[PDB]
Amino acid sequence: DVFLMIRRHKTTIFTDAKESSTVFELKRIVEGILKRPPDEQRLYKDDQLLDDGKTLGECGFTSQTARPQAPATVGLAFRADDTFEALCIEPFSSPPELPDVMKPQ
Amino acid sequence: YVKLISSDGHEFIVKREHALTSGTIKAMLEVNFREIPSHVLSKVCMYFTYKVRYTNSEIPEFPIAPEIALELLMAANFLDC
Amino acid sequence: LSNPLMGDAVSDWSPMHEAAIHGHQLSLRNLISQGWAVNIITADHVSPLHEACLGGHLSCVKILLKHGAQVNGVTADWHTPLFNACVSGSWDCVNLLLQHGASVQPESDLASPIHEAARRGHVECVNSLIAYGGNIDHKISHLGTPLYLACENQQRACVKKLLESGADVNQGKGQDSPLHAVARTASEELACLLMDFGADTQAKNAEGKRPVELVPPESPLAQLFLEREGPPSLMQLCRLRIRKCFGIQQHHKITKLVLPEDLKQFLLHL
Amino acid sequence: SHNALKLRFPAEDEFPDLSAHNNHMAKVLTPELYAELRAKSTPSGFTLDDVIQTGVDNPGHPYIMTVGCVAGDEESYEVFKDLFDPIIEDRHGGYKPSDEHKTDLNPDNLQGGDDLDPNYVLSSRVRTGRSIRGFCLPPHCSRGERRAIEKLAVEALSSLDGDLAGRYYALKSMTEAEQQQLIDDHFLFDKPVSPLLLASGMARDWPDARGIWHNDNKTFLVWVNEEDHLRVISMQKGGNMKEVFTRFCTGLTQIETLFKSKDYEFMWNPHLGYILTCPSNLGTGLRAGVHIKLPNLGKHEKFSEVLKRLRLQKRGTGVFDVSNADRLGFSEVELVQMVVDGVKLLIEMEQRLEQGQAIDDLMPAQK
Amino acid sequence: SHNALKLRFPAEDEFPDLSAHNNHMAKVLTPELYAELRAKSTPSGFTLDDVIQTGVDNPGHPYIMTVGCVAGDEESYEVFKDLFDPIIEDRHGGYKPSDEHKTDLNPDNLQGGDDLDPNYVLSSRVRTGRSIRGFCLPPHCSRGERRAIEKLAVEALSSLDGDLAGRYYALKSMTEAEQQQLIDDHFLFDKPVSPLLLASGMARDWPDARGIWHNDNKTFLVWVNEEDHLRVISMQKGGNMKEVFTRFCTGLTQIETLFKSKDYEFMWNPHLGYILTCPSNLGTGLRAGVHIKLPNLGKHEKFSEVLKRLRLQKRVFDVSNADRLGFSEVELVQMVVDGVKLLIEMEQRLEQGQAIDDLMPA
């Protein structure tokens, strides 16, 4: 099983999948929430647009990466008419400073 | 799926059934957690999946950073986890 | 006295050894004033100090040490004044001896003060030894760890103390973790503690068995193991992670963390 | 004597408080026994109180369980039998009232031990004690009685031949140079300092009639009127247990002969063997052992466990002094056989430990 | 009896080699005397071999001697008087058996003692001891009467009032807290360690029926069944011996009458005063002493002989009366008081760079 986290700007979604399933089905996994068809979606890894015809295994995702301990990260942009949205994702808040009593000696 | 909102405006789409891990969320049954920062809300979600996945099967160790341990504890307390 | 008399051990005691073991302080002083040196030893290199330590006669060891008694003297059975004090439990003598340079760590692995105290239930001496500078997780062959031993003798006071101090909940003897030990001794009380301090219910012993497999299913422990078969709570995990940031006996610093008192107690009562 | 006044009080008033005491006598002596036995006495002058004197005077130790009593003479073992049977039985591991004891110093019954490995056996030593029939023991005898014994010993010792020839020193008047020579060889002894001895009265009149005799080769040593009547020690650097045992035997064989020529013999009977002072030395009263270089086994976790089953005593020094832990129920040379056996086992035990090998296969169920 | 068995030997065999000893006993007991008294014994069974055992066991210091003889009871002083009389005569500097000794428990006879200079007198005490007629002295008593004596002593002491009211500490059940307090105040008396005491056999059965009674104000100690039956110690800081002595005398009198109300009395006779185990202490058995700060005089070469001249012991010095028999109890402390006053002024001379000269006594 594949534990995948998909994000867009400030949105995040957690979903499970099969290594044998492809990006195309994954596009429909997004659709279930998004309410927009696969052709209007742009799933991507890092900065590499994902191929509907490739499996998650084919795209480099696996049980050693996309875990329940910590899922893989795929971005999502949308088909802005004749193009698509900037492939950017806003990071979550930065961490607080570690208290001196918990800081290592 | 249920959308959870962080105090920082992040939107988390979480399978409801995993969300039901939290006693507070169970009591709540979209939910806006203005009390919980984005720095740790996503972590809590990950935990929800973790616990569900290994409920009936060895179990690997859940990852956690000292920078979130304190706030996360508090968040977990809030969420009854 | 002064030589290998080749007689029975019963014939070799000095009057000081007698005074020491029974707390005859003034007699001791008198013998000293006559000229009975405090470093007079017998057969197994046993000094008045060693006997006083076994008796727990604080004022006697104060005197003996005052006059140059060998605080780290070693007997033929590898015993030290400190070790002997731990045997009797004399909390005061343990502290005193340490203050005069008694080494917490012994030369021989046949007589660990800490492990002895663990077996005896001498909690406050365990505390002093560790605080003075003692390795709470020292593994020593046949005895495993202090924690392990406390569990073997059902010394729940020391078990709780050691675990709060920061004993490695999953380090016992060989593959026989403290949790496995509890299962073998059927103690629901110690099981509850160890589980809460992070004991690994899936760890296997030398036989490849989990703690739950080392106890009959009819016992209460079977149910208690069932309760902890699934993944731990996030708060549990958090607490474990937080505690790891503090050293041995350093968790008192938790009180300085910027958080609610309820959680402060949650962490302090680990 | 003053015992007449003791008889004017109720037994319970005389009954000593042994609550804080920890020894064999203390467990045995009851108010009932005290009440009965205090009315009896020996023909030599003993009374129950002297029998249990050292006991009540010394609680002893929380861990080391001493005997807590002392005999007075041969007759006292019968007169105060009601305590001795319980004390002896307990101290000697179930030795029963009808359990006949034997004797045997004939070297022909010692097998092996001709040469113990000198890499381990630093030295060998044999020790015993004898009492002369017709006299009392050191806890009771008068100056005159003690002096008579000295003279008998001096005569006999002056006639020993061969390697058993030697010289007698009078402790009470020996020259400081002589003291230097004998203290270097540890042949020189001194006044008892342990309260476990002093309570018996054995130090009375010291050094009157106390004596030291050793042979020309410094292998045969006997002490006169000290812890007991005749204290005999045989020793030699090296592992030749067989020869030392024989030397020892011939020492007592000739001395006994010499005493028999004057109508004296060692106190002895079929039930308790040789009759000595404290109960722990009944039967053979024979100790034997060696100084073994065991830096390895002395650190091993089961060292004392092995020695326990081998029935050997572990003692340090003034490297271990390994020695016979039994005194009664074994035929003298039999005990020496036990020591030889155990030591050879320990040498092999050490060999395997030295090489980092498992040593569990050398731990026999010896009882 | 083994005594009879010893008599089977000739006296020559039983006679100890006293040439190695330097005590008084060794210079009195001849082999002839030994032979004469060897077969003699007291009603208690006490014999010669018991009376000189200590003198035999301990060789004695080459310069400082002692006696080495230990009595068994009052009667034993009569039974073996052929030995004791010459011992006593030498021990007290000349004393014939016919010279009837005095006794005096009336403080009124003491002139002064309530006015010593507190800059020198740090503290002072009075020690003596008694024994109960009818019981044997410690060296030959059994557990039975040791306990009977304890019972009496404690019972009687518990009835004391005023500044004599107090409590009893049985050593066999005395706690560490109590121990520490008694040690702090020098009240606690532990097991004997000297050969001169051990040789008597008095250390046996330790500490059965032994203990300490003392008053609430910490001025009176009664050691029960220790070195004698009743060791009476009275003490106080400062230069007021007189009051100490009045408490001592009247307190002692009271406890004496309390025993008499129960038909008991202290051993006492016209030629030895009160009876103790050691011959040197026969008589009054009174030891009054004082801690005297004395930096200058203590370094003066005649200090010794001055105390000698005053009949005082040189035990800051612990100065005490050097006699126990030869004159009354009051006379004794009178000498102590006078001596102190003399000694104070002597030091004062030295402090002012003055000689002692005319302060030397006889």
Residue numbers in the entry:
A (entry chain E): 2 to 106
B (entry chain D): 18 to 46, 59 to 86, 89 to 112
C (entry chain C): 25 to 294
D (entry chain A): 6 to 323, 333 to 381
E (entry chain B): 6 to 320, 333 to 379
What's the paper's own text on this?
CKB binds as a dimer to the N-terminal ankyrin repeat of ASB9 as previously predicted from HDX-MS data, kinetic data, and modeling. The partial helix positions D32 in the active site of one CKB monomer, consistent with previous biophysical experiments demonstrating the critical role of this residue in the interaction. These data suggest that the structure of ASB9 residues 25–34 may position D32 in the CKB active site leading to the higher affinity binding of ASB9 1–252 as compared to the weaker binding of ASB9 35–252. Peptides corresponding to ASB9 residues 25–31, 25–42, 43–52, 50–59, 64–84, 85–99, and 100–107 all showed statistically significant decreases in exchange upon association with CKB, demonstrating that at least two ankyrin repeats of ASB9 engage in the CKB binding interaction. Peptides corresponding to ASB9 residues 176–214, 218–237, 238–248, 249–258, 249–261, 262–289, and 284–291 all showed decreased exchange in the presence of ELOB/C.
The Cullin 5 (CUL5) Ring E3 ligase uses adaptors Elongins B and C (ELOB/C) to bind different SOCS-box-containing substrate receptors, determining the substrate specificity of the ligase. The 18-member ankyrin and SOCS box (ASB) family is the largest substrate receptor family. ASB9 and CUL5 behave as rigid rods, connected through a hinge provided by ELOB/C transmitting long-range allosteric crosstalk from the substrate through CUL5 to the RBX2 flexible linker.
